[PDB]
Design an enzyme around this catalytic site. Structure first.
Site, PDB file in Angstrom:
ATOM      1  N   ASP A 103       0.828  -1.205   0.000  1.00  0.00           N
ATOM      2  CA  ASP A 103       0.000   0.000   0.000  1.00  0.00           C
ATOM      3  C   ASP A 103       0.867   1.261   0.000  1.00  0.00           C
ATOM      4  O   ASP A 103       0.799   2.106   0.895  1.00  0.00           O
ATOM      5  CB  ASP A 103      -0.978  -0.006   1.176  1.00  0.00           C
ATOM      6  CG  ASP A 103      -2.091  -1.020   0.998  1.00  0.00           C
ATOM      7  OD1 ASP A 103      -2.445  -1.317  -0.163  1.00  0.00           O
ATOM      8  OD2 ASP A 103      -2.611  -1.520   2.016  1.00  0.00           O
ATOM      9  N   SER A 104       1.700   1.361  -1.032  1.00  0.00           N
ATOM     10  CA  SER A 104       2.479   2.560  -1.297  1.00  0.00           C
ATOM     11  C   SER A 104       2.576   2.724  -2.805  1.00  0.00           C
ATOM     12  O   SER A 104       2.304   1.793  -3.566  1.00  0.00           O
ATOM     13  CB  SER A 104       3.871   2.495  -0.656  1.00  0.00           C
ATOM     14  OG  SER A 104       4.644   1.451  -1.215  1.00  0.00           O
TER      15      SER A 104
END
Ligand SMILES: [Zn+2]
Ligand SMILES: [Zn+2]
Lengths: 372, 48, 116, 46, 360, 434
Positions: free
Chosen positions: F302-303
RNA sequence: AGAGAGGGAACCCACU
């Protein structure tokens, strides 16, 4: 709210009377001016200016006074206090203004309004859910001693007093009533300001309905379904000892939140409870005995239907059973108490300044801080 | 009161004696990095 | 009657004989409402200053002395209703006391205070 | 020594004094806006 | 016999409540709504509530109806207990006085001249004033020159003076005040007030002997203390029992070579050791100095405590050399070598040499 | 809060169309705090007296004039909960009441009639707080929204034909939650009025458009039905947090924590409902050429990997405004705040910071760079013991918030409610995406 | 080259 409900609150407050020559004060016609700031001269306060200077975008509220001492004098447009205005209302400055005019006032046309400016802070009154008032509900307290409990959060519209929930419960004890005689389940009612479980038949007798046949007419509308009559039979047979309206009202007055002194002043307290505490939505008057009896019979009949299953139980989360208190009802609920407190302070001032023998000063009687 | 000052999860025994504010600690967001070992953390300069 | 009741709080003085509390105006205009016939302070201010007290503690609004235990403890049951003093500081001169005793009225002190 | 403020709605400028109530001379508008500073500003165009 | 019932009242308005109740009783004593209570008591020093004498609580409630000053005791009444009814009427009881009201409250006033009219007396006071300089305060001497300089309400008669609300002073205030506005009994000023215008001290742990009686020459340590007849319980040498001695029989006797302090007099505050105990002259040497201090036996106590006895800062600079050349900033910190520059463009403060900086 | 039960928090069936199903705070207040749907409208309530007069006009028998024998063979009629009487013929009474509501003769459009048919009841609600939503009216499997209504509705501002005129035409009407229990609701007309293997063929109302069941923040989601519901809820949480031009007059407002964007864009992929939230006029976000690719390993858990050159071209480069307010207090001469430039030799307790940034009145002129622990408001409060020496009024100054920096945007000087001098300083700091 | 900081409590919205 600000168009009708404030006037309703003002008119629904009783005209306060003081006994010496008597005099009474009455408020009849209200006036709601445009938001204005001041020390200083009256000038229209634009909401952005109120936001920048940490002012309160509030409009002043006047009312006319009429006192009769009788010697009556009227006092038009007496300043009650300032009440806040949410933007884009019908009493805000920028109502119906064109977008060019709004841009001249440093206010954007994109702003939807609906928020108050209090000390420069923009406040939003979040709509609060609540159970729908004046509606009969049948729930099941499966952990308590009651099989099915009915309730009706009765609240008369435009009444300063809050809601007063009455419960019509049926003692469960599916078998015996922990006795060698108590066979059936007994229906019992929780009235406001009464701490004991009053039987239903006691209340029906206390409403001026002495015959069991008449009470059964008001409860069960068909005499050709013996099953419901048999189910209501134990509750009817609990209170065959009490037969008079006098004795029924005396038992109503027994074990109240304010207990009675003797047979006297306890009959009147029970009458007051049956007149002004339970079921205000069916009316508060001397002739509203039979309407209240009809509605209580409806509550008991719906409880019997729930105990039979002919009608399903009611859901606490069904949104037909809920109401949404918006800014209108919320500000009305606030204004009821604050207007009543202003009346109380005026009464205290009058009590102080009649015992000196002089005449009170009405501008000093109404203090504006308690309402603004 | 004193009993209210001691009895809570914000009192003296839990709140101050068990879990207390400490010096020499930093708190910032983490972002991934696959170019350093598993026992290495890349701290900023302004924290160091 | 209302004539006995003081009109204001200023210059309240208690009698040295019956501990009757009245203003100086009422002592000047009415004398003593109980035993002025034995004292005769009406029509004389100096008689009032000699027969009334400037120091008193506690007041009693004796309304019905015929059925009062307070009147039994303060020995004012046989008097008229009015405002009385609990403790009175002061004393009549020997001439007034001797004159009262010659008329059969022994002077009992109203100073019922516990002096240390 | 006097500070020049821009008179809000008026958009005109006037002097001000220490311990002086904040008022415009045109219409007595209460909101003043301080003028931009006279010292230099330099911005990296990044 | 009727009983007394407590009725809460407005504070400071209890006597007027009794007067109003008496007027109400007389005004309705012939009507069909009589006051069935017997008496109303509003004491001199009991502040907050009054007493109603009646056989019933309902009589009290129906008698106080219409009285607003008693509205906080209207709903419920509390009866004074039977054994405590006599405590209701029980009453207990060139000089110096202390003023009751004003800014001179409880300040020492020397009674200069007693006016025989029995209304006021002349009082010598020390002014608590600011000489009309702050108001548009402790006690200090009356400065007539300062009040002549500042002006205002002031009139001068040499050392006599009138100022600021008909305050009369001379050389020291000399103003008339009422006898009922002062307390003429129980002031007892101190020595410092004499310059402005027996005793027993036994402590637990001290050693005392017995000077007279059948228990003479019994030295014991003090346990308790009382006011005049102490009935002390001293722990004597070789005696497990506790005897009894009053204050007039004991004396602060101390063996030679012990911690001693001085309680009062010229020698107070000093400590040390005593050397030889005479009949009453007790000589000692201090912890500070080796001077002979001779004290009375009563002025000694046993206490075991120890005796006390840069230029570039805030200057807009321009980096004229290096990678940051052309940046305008403000110097936050500066040294002999380097200086920290708060850059106007970036959100960062960086340090550069002073040789690379050029001020505006 | 913090209740272990679930029934007050769950998405009940009667939340359809009145309240958004997706938007909710997903913390410890799931389901409790809700967001209203788009077309949902809360009835402001009217007086029941005209309804009672109308009922007494027709053959409704009041409770004080009835026998208790003819009650069970007729329908009990309620108004606002209170039982007003009985009526013998429930049909042609509900028809009459609806006919009056489709014309706004006596009964307001917000008032609701409910005929309980299984149990003989008919309840009319005129309360203030009920939550309704407009629906089309289906007479015959035919809609009453004819082509002429659309023709008169396209030409608005010319015919003055508004939504209220269509409500008055008896085409749409507001249905609340009680009345939804007794309505046969068509989803869309293109499917549920044409003859087929018939489902019910007894429709009373038709939904205007299903997309109007969503809230304001769930309406900006493209293809929200293709997502998973928790994802829709989380996006509803995030959408009230996206930077953007929150208001048009943001340069006048002295708001605290103003987040505005350099180059906001309308979405290329939009809904029809964004035209009515005016999301295309005050947008929040930028259209970006994303690629869904595994790479060097910095878009791992989740980047996202960003483009440095794009950011240098003003991509998501925002600007953060923060205001600081301070006034002086005229008091009983013991402590007296006043705006002035404090001096080291004169003021006491002066913290070590730069005070030459201030002007002669103790304030910062706009356009001056400030950083952490830089003074912005020079204010000194007097000391009562300055005479009770040589050391006078103490510093009571508001510094710039530490670990923050930026340029002072603008400063306003005015008077407060109490008439005391009062200053606000809005400080500007651009935020390049890092 | 003169060198430290204090408030405190209450309640809302989010964040993982
Ligand atoms: Zn007498
Ligand atoms: Zn101007």
């Amino acid at each position: 709210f600000i168009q009708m409900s404030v006037q309703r609150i003002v008119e629904d407050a009783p005209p306060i009377d003081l006994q010496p020559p008597r005099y009474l004060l009455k408020f009849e016609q209200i006036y709601l001016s445009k938001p204005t700031h001041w020390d200083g001269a009256p000038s229209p306060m634009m909401p952005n200016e109120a936001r920048l200077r940490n002012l309160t975008y509030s409009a002043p509220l006047y009312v006319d006074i009429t006192k009769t001492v009788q010697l009556q004098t009227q006092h038009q447009k007496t300043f009650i206090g300032k009440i806040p205005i949410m933007l884009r209302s019908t009493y805000c400055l920028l109502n119906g203004l064109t977008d060019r005019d709004l841009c001249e006032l440093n206010e954007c046309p994109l702003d939807p309004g609906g928020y108050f400016i209090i000390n420069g802070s923009e406040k939003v009154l979040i709509a609060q859910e609540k159970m729908a008032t004046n509606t009969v509900y049948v729930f099941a307290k499966k952990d308590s001693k009651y099989a099915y409990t009915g309730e009706c959060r009765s609240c008369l519209e435009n009444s300063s007093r809050p809601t007063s929930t009455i419960w019509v419960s049926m003692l469960a004890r599916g078998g015996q009533g922990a006795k060698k005689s108590a066979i059936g389940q007994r229906i019992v009612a929780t009235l406001p300001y009464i701490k004991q479980e009053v039987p239903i038949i006691i209340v029906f007798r206390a409403l001026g309905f002495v015959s069991d046949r008449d009470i059964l007419e008001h409860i069960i509308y068909d005499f050709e379904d013996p099953e419901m009559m048999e189910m209501v039979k134990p509750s009817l047979d609990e209170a065959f000892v009490i037969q008079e309206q006098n004795v029924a009202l005396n038992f109503i007055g027994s074990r109240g939140a304010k207990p009675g002194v003797t047979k006297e002043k306890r009959i009147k307290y029970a009458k007051e409870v049956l007149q002004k505490e339970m079921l205000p939505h069916v009316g508060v008057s001397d002739f509203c005995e039979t309407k209240k009896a009809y509605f209580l019979g409806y509550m008991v009949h719906r409880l019997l239907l729930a105990a039979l299953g002919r009608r399903e139980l009611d859901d606490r989360d069904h949104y037909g059973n809920k109401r949404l208190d918006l800014a209108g009802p919320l500000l009305a609920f606030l204004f009821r108490g604050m207007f009543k407190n202003l009346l109380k302070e005026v009464r205290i001032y009058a009590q102080k300044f009649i015992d000196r023998g002089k005449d009170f000063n009405l501008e000093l009687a109404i203090k504006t801080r308690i309402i603004s | 009161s004193l009993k209210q000052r001691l009895k809570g999860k914000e009192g003296r025994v839990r709140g101050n004696l068990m879990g207390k504010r400490v010096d020499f600690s930093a708190r910032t967001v983490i972002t991934p990095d696959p170019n350093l070992s598993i026992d290495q953390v890349g701290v900023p300069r302004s924290i160091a | 009657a209302l004539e006995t009741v003081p009109k204001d709080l200023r210059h309240l003085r208690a009698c040295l004989l019956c501990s009757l509390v009245k203003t100086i105006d009422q002592f000047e205009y009415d004398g003593c409402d109980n035993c002025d016939a034995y004292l005769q302070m009406k029509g004389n201010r100096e008689m009032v200053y000699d027969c009334t007290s400037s120091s008193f503690d506690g007041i009693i609004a004796m309304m019905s002395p015929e059925d009062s235990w307070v009147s039994k403890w303060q020995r004012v049951s046989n008097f008229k209703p009015g405002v009385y003093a609990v403790s009175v500081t002061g004393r009549l001169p020997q001439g007034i006391v001797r004159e009262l005793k010659s008329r059969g009225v022994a002077y009992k002190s109203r100073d019922t205070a516990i002096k240390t | 020594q006097p500070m020049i403020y821009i008179c809000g709605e008026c958009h005109t400028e006037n002097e001000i004094k220490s311990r002086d109530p904040i008022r415009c001379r045109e219409c007595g508008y209460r909101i003043m806006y301080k003028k931009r500073t006279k010292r230099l500003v330099v911005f990296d165009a990044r | 016999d009727p009983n007394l019932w407590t009725v809460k009242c407005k504070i400071g308005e209890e006597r007027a409540t009794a007067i109003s109740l008496m007027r109400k009783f007389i005004a309705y004593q012939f009507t069909d709504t009589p006051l069935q209570i017997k008496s109303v008591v509003a004491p001199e020093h009991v502040k907050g509530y009054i007493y109603v004498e009646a056989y019933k609580q309902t009589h009290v409630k129906q008698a106080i109806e219409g009285v607003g000053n008693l509205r906080l005791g209207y709903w419920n009444q509390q009866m004074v207990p039977i054994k405590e009814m006599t405590d209701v009427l029980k009453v207990v009881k060139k000089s110096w006085v202390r003023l009751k009201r004003g800014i001179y409250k409880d300040d020492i006033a020397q009674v200069d001249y007693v006016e025989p009219s029995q209304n006021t007396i002349s009082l010598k006071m020390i002014p608590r004033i600011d000489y009309d300089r702050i108001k548009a305060p402790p006690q200090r001497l009356f400065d007539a020159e300062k009040i002549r300089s500042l002006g205002g309400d002031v009139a001068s008669d040499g050392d006599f003076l009138i100022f600021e609300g008909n305050r009369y002073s001379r050389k020291f205030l000399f103003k008339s005040f009422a006898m009922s506005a002062v307390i003429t009994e129980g002031v007892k000023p101190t020595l410092s007030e004499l310059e402005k215008f027996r005793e027993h001290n036994f402590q637990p742990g001290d050693n005392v002997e017995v000077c007279e009686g059948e228990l003479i020459n019994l030295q014991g340590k003090i346990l308790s203390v009382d006011g005049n007849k102490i009935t002390i319980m001293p722990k004597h040498e070789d005696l497990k029992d506790m005897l009894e001695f009053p204050a007039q029989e004991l004396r602060k006797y101390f063996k030679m070579g012990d911690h001693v302090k001085v309680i009062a007099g010229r020698f107070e505050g000093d400590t040390g050791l005593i050397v030889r105990v005479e009949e009453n002259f007790v000589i000692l040497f201090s912890d500070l100095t080796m001077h002979e201090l001779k004290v009375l036996p009563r002025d000694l106590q046993l206490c075991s405590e120890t005796a006390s006895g840069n230029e570039l800062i805030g200057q807009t600079v321009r980096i004229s050399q290096g990678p940051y050349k052309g940046y305008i900033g403000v110097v936050k910190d500066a040294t002999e070598s380097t200086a920290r520059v708060e850059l106007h463009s970036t959100c960062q403060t960086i340090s550069v040499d002073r040789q690379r900086l050029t001020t505006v | 809060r913090d209740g272990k039960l679930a029934k007050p928090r769950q998405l009940h069936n009667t939340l359809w169309g009145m309240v958004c199903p997706a938007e909710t705070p997903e913390g410890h207040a799931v389901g409790l705090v809700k967001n209203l749907a788009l077309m949902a409208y809360i009835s402001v309530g009217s007086q029941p007296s005209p309804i009672l007069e109308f009922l007494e006009e027709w053959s409704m028998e009041n409770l004080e004039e009835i026998s208790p024998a003819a009650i069970a063979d007729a329908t009990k009629i309620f108004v606002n909960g209170c039982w007003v009487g009985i009526h013998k013929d429930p049909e042609q009474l509900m028809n009459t009441l609806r006919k009056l509501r489709r014309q706004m003769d006596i009964i307001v459009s917000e008032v609701s009639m409910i005929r309980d048919i299984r149990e003989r009841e008919i309840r009319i609600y005129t309360d203030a707080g009920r939550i309704c939503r407009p629906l089309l009216i289906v007479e015959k499997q035919k809609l009453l929204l004819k082509k002429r209504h659309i023709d008169q509705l396209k030409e608005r501002e010319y015919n003055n034909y508004s939504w209220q005129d269509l409500v008055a035409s008896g085409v749409v009407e507001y249905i609340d939650t009680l009345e939804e229990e007794t309505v046969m609701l068509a989803m869309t007309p293109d499917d549920l009025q044409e003859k087929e293997v018939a489902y019910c063929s007894t429709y009373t109302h038709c939904e205007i458009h299903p997309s109007m069941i969503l809230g304001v923040c769930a309406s900006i989601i493209p293809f929200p039905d293709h997502n998973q519901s928790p994802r829709n809820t989380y996006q509803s949480a995030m959408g009230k947090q996206a930077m953007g031009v929150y208001i048009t007059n943001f340069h006048v407002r002295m708001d605290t924590l103003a987040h505005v964007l350099y180059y906001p864009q309308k979405p290329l992929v939009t809904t029809r409902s964004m035209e009515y939230l005016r999301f295309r006029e005050l947008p929040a976000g930028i259209n970006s050429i994303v690629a869904i690719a595994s790479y060097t390993g910095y878009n791992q858990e989740d980047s996202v990997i960003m483009n440095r050159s794009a950011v240098d071209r003003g991509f998501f480069r925002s600007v953060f405004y923060r205001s600081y307010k301070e006034q002086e207090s005229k008091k009983g001469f013991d402590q007296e705040e006043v705006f002035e430039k404090p001096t080291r030799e004169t003021c006491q307790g002066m913290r070590h910071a730069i005070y030459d940034k201030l002007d002669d009145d103790g304030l910062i002129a706009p356009g001056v760079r400030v950083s952490g622990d830089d003074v912005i408001i020079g204010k000194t409060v007097t000391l009562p013991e300055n005479e009770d020496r040589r050391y006078t009024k103490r510093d009571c100054s508001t510094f710039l918030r530490t670990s923050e920096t930026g340029i002072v945007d603008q400063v306003m000087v005015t008077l407060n409610q109490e008439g005391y001098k009062f200053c606000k300083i809005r400080v500007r700091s651009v935020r390049i995406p890092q």
